[PDB]
């Protein structure tokens, strides 16, 4: 019943005291955070409190969309020796700091995601050459489907790959994806290995990567410029915004204190120093 938008408990008036009750004392040893209120130690007047936690509820903490990647595509001239670059990005929040740290506060979570795609383009060669408005395709290849090979092979016939066709110069594109985990919650951390090295086998085939699980494998996104070759080369970038919605979490962990290094929890040398200098005696 107590919703997020409820007023915090009104602080009671309390006067002088000389009793055997000891509020003030604890023994953090138990592990219990001593639960005192202002009125417990000092004298308080009555106060009708109006502040509510409404803007810090799990929902609101993740309520902002966030950049997750920068995918590069381009459409060079047909005369060019280099091949028309189509980008393929594996879907993982771990590619950028920002969302990851916000997600790390929790061991597990269930969240239906909403993706937004802002696509910006530009010329490269200093030619007063033109280019007609381009049309992009963002194809979601789920784990195991054939990943595109050429900017123009069959794979793009999207028989079943849910795709999006975005014309440039229009409002950014957006799609909703429900919770797609193979579990009951997405694992932000996986302690263990996929393969158990067996006693009657080669170490090679018995070896995997620590903290690498399928739990967080979700296929790739394929992006290409649909318009064919154009005399004047035009590169473009596709920024992907992810905003977790209908979110819920489990088990708090301490926030990441030193610069992240790679997909694991691992850290690099030099970066292991977070706090600064300050004196024990200077306020």
């Amino acid at each position, epitope marked *: 019943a107590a919703t997020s938008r409820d007023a915090l408990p009104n602080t009671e008036a309390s006067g002088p005291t000389h009793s055997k009750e000891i509020p003030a004392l604890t023994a953090v040893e138990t592990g219990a955070t001593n639960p005192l209120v202002p009125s417990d130690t000092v004298q308080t007047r009555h106060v009708v409190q109006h502040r509510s936690r409404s803007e810090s509820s799990i929902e609101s903490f993740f309520a902002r969309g966030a950049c997750v990647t920068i995918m590069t595509v381009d459409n060079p001239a047909s005369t060019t020796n280099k091949d028309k670059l189509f*980008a*393929v*990005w*594996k879907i993982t929040y771990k590619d950028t700091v920002q969302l990851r740290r916000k997600l790390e506060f929790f061991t597990y979570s269930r969240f239906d995601m909403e993706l937004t795609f802002v696509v910006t383009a530009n010329f490269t060669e200093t030619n007063n050459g033109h280019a007609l408005n381009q049309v992009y395709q963002i194809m979601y290849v789920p784990p195991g489907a054939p990943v595109p*090979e*050429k900017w123009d092979d069959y794979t793009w016939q999207t028989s079943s790959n849910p795709s999006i066709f975005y014309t440039y110069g229009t409002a950014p594109a957006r799609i909703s994806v429900p919770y797609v985990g193979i579990s009951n919650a997405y694992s932000h951390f996986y302690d263990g*290995f*996929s*393969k158990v090295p067996l006693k009657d086998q080669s170490a*090679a*085939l018995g*070896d*995997s*990567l620590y903290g*690498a*699980a*399928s739990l967080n*494998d979700f296929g790739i996104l394929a992006v290409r410029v649909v318009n064919d070759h154009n005399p004047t080369k035009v590169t473009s970038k596709i920024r992907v915004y992810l905003k977790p919605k209908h979110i819920r979490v489990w088990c708090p962990r301490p926030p990441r204190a030193v610069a992240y290094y*790679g*997909p694991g929890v691992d850290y690099k040398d030099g970066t292991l120093t977070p706090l600064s200098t300050k004196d024990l005696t200077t306020y």
Partner: nanobody, 126 residues
Framework: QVQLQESGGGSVQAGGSLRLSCAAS????????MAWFRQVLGEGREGVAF????????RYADTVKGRFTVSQDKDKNTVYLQMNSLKPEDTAIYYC???????????????????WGQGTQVTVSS
């Protein structure tokens, strides 16, 4: 298709040290399992050392192990092969293959390798 632009052989004599560079053209990120090889003149086409793109873990061939070290240029998509202690028998047409990957499984020889390199030959004179 992934392209593996290799570089760059030569027939220096015993104990030598050269290196091979091979690009991801290609989309080096989580996929490719950049591996090394050398075709022992018609005998002959063995796998040298192989690196994992995702983590940077190397494994070598019982032959090359130690002298040869596989290096990785993550950001500029290149995988090197510091060919050390080049002895006469380090004469063979070198290779650079790169397959895909298993999400978490280490890049080994029994695993890859879908795509093929140029096959730039390094010979060790006697």
């Amino acid at each position: 298709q992934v392209q593996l632009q290799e570089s760059g052989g030569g027939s220096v004599q015993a104990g030598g040290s050269l290196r091979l560079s091979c690009a991801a053209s290609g989309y080096q990120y989580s996929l490719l399992c950049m591996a090394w090889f050398r075709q022992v003149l018609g005998e002959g086409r063995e796998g040298v050392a192989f690196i994992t793109t995702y983590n940077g873990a190397m494994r070598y061939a019982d032959t090359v192990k130690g002298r040869f070290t596989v290096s990785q240029d993550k950001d500029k998509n290149t995988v090197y092969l510091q060919m050390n202690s080049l002895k006469p028998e380090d004469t063979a047409i070198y290779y650079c293959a790169a397959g895909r990957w298993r999400f978490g499984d280490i890049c080994h020889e029994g695993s890859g390798y879908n795509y093929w390199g140029q096959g730039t030959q390094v010979t060790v004179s006697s």
